[PDB]
Amino acid sequence: LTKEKLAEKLNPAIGYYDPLGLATADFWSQGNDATWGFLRHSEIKHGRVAMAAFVGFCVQSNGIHFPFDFQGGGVSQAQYAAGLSPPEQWDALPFAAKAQIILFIGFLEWWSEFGGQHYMRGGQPGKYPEFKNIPLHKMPNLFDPLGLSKGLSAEQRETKLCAEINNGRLAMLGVFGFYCAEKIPGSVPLLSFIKPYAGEIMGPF
Amino acid sequence: SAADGMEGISHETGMKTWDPLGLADLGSPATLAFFRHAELKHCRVAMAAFVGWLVAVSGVHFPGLCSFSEGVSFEDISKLTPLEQWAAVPALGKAQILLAIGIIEHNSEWKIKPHYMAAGGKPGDLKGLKSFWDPAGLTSKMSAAKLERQRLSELKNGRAAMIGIISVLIAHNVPGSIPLPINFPAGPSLILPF
Amino acid sequence: AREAELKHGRICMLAAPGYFFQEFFQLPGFPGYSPNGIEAVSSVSPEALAQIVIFMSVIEYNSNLNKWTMDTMFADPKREPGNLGFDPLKFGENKNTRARLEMAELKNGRLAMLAFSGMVHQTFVTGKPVWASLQDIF
């Protein structure tokens, strides 16, 4: 649906709000429709990644940790070490683990760009295509591998997507609040309990 | 004059085209289009130059080194006066900066087929070089009247900027020009490109 | 003779501002600079004057290709006195002020010939540059 209608199903009070005017932009001389699709798919990607980041930060900072080991060869584990903060756990992971995680996410991103109609060229922003026609690889779909979300009938699905966009935006704000309280003292009134350091965070390796 | 439909009439001199020496009348509409393109180029270069001069005076610089071969850090170069900064840039760096600028200028004259010195002039029009001007579409939110106001503000700011850049460049070199007693940075008022 | 008059006037009205402002200003870092033109040309390296002369000769030869004699030049009826075609900004398309600009070019060129002659000979008389020689009169 249109920009005004979307921003009005997301928040009637605020309504459409775009000081930068990127919704009318023309990235790469592709066209306003394609560029609006690109912008919508990024927000949904940022929101999804941010919600996952928040729940992961919450789960792994408290102390929950997997038992099936990572380094291999009967070697001590750096990330499983005291109440280490999650960015420092990521740093403490070995380089091979980080590279392969990033490459797996890269394959997921490549498949999202590849399968199905593209979000820019008349495709739904945020739909993950189905893992089909890949030779010698049959895997559950990334979205709903169990498929227990059939029956919304396209009446509740759009409102659920609006809730996703919201929750995603709030998750971006929350996780960056965590990082800013962590690497800038006093950035948030709460979150002072977070440790004073993380690392560069914007540097994976 | 020939300069009535052109979009540069200010509110400070009044709503009459300030052409006291009548240079707009002398020449063709192609000549006046060349004048407008030159004015807008000088405006844009002067805005960028004044921002660069402020950056150089402040001392903020990129983290890194200009050349891994030559011992020229941005920290090292920031200690000189603004024009000796360019004098201290490496020769190859200056050469490729000028190469990029010249490529941009040649393509501006080439690929924008309805030329400024031609019918359907569009003198300062460099949009057409795709993704060069406003790659992010910031002005795309603006209507016709707002665009006209922004263009007038462009010309006003750039005119002031090209006055100011020359002012700061000459104020220390010839003392007493600018009445203010602020101690402008030393150094040349003019640098040869290589 | 109008082709010569215009050529001489153009050379002289490039020379006179050059002679008068080379005392005040220097090309940044140039060697052999002197404020007065005569010892300036004496001191400047010969392979700079040679390149200037080569530039002028290249322009003259390419502009006057196959037309260097009184008949060969102006053999073409269109070819006008001094109309070498150098007008990048196209002031000549406006034909209302063409006569004004032509007369102004002619008068300014003539005045520049006389002015450059005066500057050079005053420098010969005094041994000092143009502005110094002038300001030591009053």
Ligand code: CLA
């Ligand atoms: C008859 C013409 C003439 C001649 C023969 C010379 C000869 C000389 N000049 Mg130059 N000079 C001239 C005119 C001339 N000048 C003019 C008009 C000026 C501007 C005031 C200067 C300013 C000048 C300075 C500041 C210096 C010299 C110096 C010199 C000497 C070394 C060469 C050099 O560095 O040139 C430098 C040349 C210039 C800075 C620019 C020359 C301008 C040309 C002739 C204009 C023609 C191009 C045209 C306008 C462009 C058309 C554009 C169109 C396509 C749009 C040499 C004796 C140096 C000296 O003093 O050595 C003792 C020196 O430092 N000259």
Ligand SMILES: CC(=O)O[C@H]1CC(C)(C)C(=C=C/C(C)=C/C=C/C(C)=C/C=C/C=C(C)/C=C/C=C(\C)C(=O)C[C@@]23O[C@]2(C)C[C@@H](O)CC3(C)C)[C@](C)(O)C1
């Ligand atoms: C300081 C002060 O004063 O204030 C503040 C400042 C500050 C920093 C902002 C604060 C914070 C943090 C905040 C606000 C953090 C917010 C985080 C947020 C908002 C995190 C959402 C995650 C959602 C997930 C993972 C959902 C997955 C959901 C999945 C995978 C689904 O299955 C969805 C589903 O639709 C399908 C696909 C199928 C349908 O059948 C229906 C269901 C539901 C099953 C504080 C602490 O509050 C303090």
Ligand SMILES: CC(=O)O[C@H]1CC(C)(C)C(=C=C/C(C)=C/C=C/C(C)=C/C=C/C=C(C)/C=C/C=C(\C)C(=O)C[C@@]23O[C@]2(C)C[C@@H](O)CC3(C)C)[C@](C)(O)C1
């Ligand atoms: C009296 C005395 O003695 O001294 C006085 C006078 C004297 C001598 C003149 C002095 C001086 C110097 C002066 C006054 C210098 C002035 C310099 C000046 C005026 C410099 C402008 C730069 C502008 C830039 C770079 C803008 C870029 C802007 C860009 C690229 C935009 O995108 C604009 C944008 O709109 C679009 C296109 C679309 C919108 O959607 C978004 C925004 C809004 C972002 C003194 C010494 O200071 C004080």
Ligand code: KC2
């Ligand atoms: C204006 C924009 C600009 C562009 C678009 C651009 C693009 C590329 C590309 C891609 C096509 C490559 C592959 C490349 C490579 C190198 N660039 Mg380069 N470059 C630009 C600007 C400068 C400046 C200002 C300097 C510079 C340099 C170097 C050196 C170091 C050499 C060395 O250490 O000797 C290397 C290897 C420095 C230099 O040459 O220093 C003497 C230096 O100062 N570049 N550059």
Ligand SMILES: CC1=C(C#C/C(C)=C/C=C/C(C)=C/C=C/C=C(C)/C=C/C=C(C)/C=C/[C@@]23O[C@]2(C)C[C@@H](O)CC3(C)C)C(C)(C)C[C@H](O)C1
């Ligand atoms: C062709 C063309 C173009 C052009 C052009 C250009 C570059 C034009 C340049 C013109 C130029 C540069 C013209 C100088 C005149 C100088 C004169 C008359 C000097 C008199 C000097 C005199 C009378 C001096 C006299 C004295 O010194 C004497 C003798 C004795 C001393 O004691 C002191 C005094 C002062 C008394 C465009 C615009 C670039 C493109 C377009 O397409 C068309």
